[PDB]
């Protein structure tokens, strides 16, 4: 039989980690998803930019299209190789993860103090049963009270630390959300910006229905 209110928090942190361990790989591949998009556009465009040599007035549309596709691919690579938000957050997560692994090892240390509480409870039972040395059973009345005093202290101590660590997740969860959108938004902004060469051309279709 152990300390329930210690296990609750150790579990609650364990849970926080499962979250961190789920999102970390997701975070690192966020820029990956857009790469596919850029390359997909770049591929289509420069498929149409192939055997259309004729320098037709309509070669401009396709040419300016593929120029605008190249445009995007570069400015993606820019906000991928040079974007901070995620790089930052990943590290903050790595520190905060390691920061709960040390709390695991402080958790396992406590069980040594539980051998105190469970050692001396067994003796004080047996020594009082075989009612023989009243002054020995008096020294264990102390040792038991020493074990519970210390165990209870080191729990209250660690609980207090486990609390303050659980607290951090809130800020860093918030950062993740911000950082992700920040980034995803930045990519969209880049797609729109890259499109400027073609914008004029697009309007002739948006109307057509007939």
Kindly tell me which residue out of 73, 106, 118, 175 binds a copy of itself, with binding defined by CB under 8 A.
Answer: 175
CB of 60 to a copy of itself, least distance (A): 9
Q: Count of residues binding a copy of itself (CB under 8 A)?
A: 60
Q: Which is nearer to a copy of itself, 2 or 11 (CB)?
A: 11
Q: Which of residues 16-35 bind a copy of itself (CB under 8 A)?
A: 16, 19, 22-23, 26-27, 29-30, 33-34
Could you give the string, one character per residue 39-58, with x where binding to a copy of itself holds by CB under 8 A and - elsewhere? -xx-xxx-xx-xxx-x-x-x
- Interaction between residue 73 and a copy of itself (CB under 8 A): no
Q: Which is nearer to a copy of itself, 159 or 191 (CB)?
A: 191
Tell me which long-range contacts 171-176 makes (C-beta under 8 A, separation of at least 24): 172/89, 172/92, 172/93, 172/96, 173/19, 175/89, 175/92, 176/23, 176/27, 176/89, 176/93
Per-residue DSSP letters for 147-192?
HHHHHHHHHHHHHHHHHHHHHHHHHHHHHHHHHHHHHHHHHHHHHH
Report the 10 Å Cβ neighbour count for 188.
Answer: 10
Q: Which is nearer to a copy of itself, 104 or 112 (CB)?
A: 104
Q: Which is nearer to a copy of itself, 127 or 190 (CB)?
A: 190
Helix boundaries (H) for 49-135: 59-81, 85-129
Angle, in degrees to the nearest 10, between helices 4-28 and 136-194: 20
User: Distance (Å, rounded) from C-alpha 157 to C-alpha 10?
Assistant: 13
- Interaction between residue 173 and a copy of itself (CB under 8 A): yes
Q: Which of residues 80-119 bind a copy of itself (CB under 8 A)?
A: 85
Question: Residue 19: which residues within 8 A CB-CB, separation 6 or more?
Answer: 169, 173
Angle at 184 between CA 181 and CA 190, to 5 degrees: 135
Q: Which of residues 112-171 bind a copy of itself (CB under 8 A)?
A: 169-171
Name the residues that contact a copy of itself, by CB under 8 A.
Answer: 12, 15-16, 19, 22-23, 26-27, 29-30, 33-34, 36-37, 40-41, 43-45, 47-48, 50-52, 54, 56, 58-59, 61-62, 65-66, 68, 85, 169-171, 173-182, 184-185, 188-189, 191-192, 195, 198, 201-202, 204-206
């Amino acid at each position: 039989s152990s300390n329930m209110e210690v296990e609750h928090w150790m579990t609650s942190l364990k849970e926080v980690e499962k979250v961190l361990d789920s999102v970390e790989p997701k975070l690192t591949s966020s820029g990956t998803k857009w790469r596919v998009v850029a390359q997909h556009i770049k591929d289509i465009c420069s498929d149409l930019n192939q055997i259309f040599n004729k320098e037709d007035p309509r070669y401009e549309v396709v040419q300016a299209g593929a120029s605008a596709a190249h445009d995007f691919d570069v400015r993606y690579l820019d906000i991928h190789k040079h974007g901070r938000e995620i790089a930052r957050l990943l590290e903050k997560i790595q520190k905060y993860r390691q920061e709960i692994e040390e709390i695991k090892k402080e958790y396992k240390e406590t069980d040594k103090y539980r051998e105190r509480y469970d050692h001396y409870k067994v003796k004080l039972d047996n020594l009082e049963k075989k009612n023989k040395d009243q002054e020995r059973i008096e020294r264990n009345q102390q040792k038991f009270k020493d074990a519970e005093a210390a165990y209870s202290s080191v729990c209250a101590d660690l609980i207090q630390k486990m609390e303050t660590v659980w607290k951090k997740h809130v800020s860093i969860f918030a950062e993740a959300a911000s950082a992700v959108w920040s980034t995803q938004l930045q990519y969209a902004k880049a797609l729109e910006a890259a499109a400027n060469p073609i914008v004029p051309y697009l309007q002739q279709e948006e109307q057509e229905e007939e």
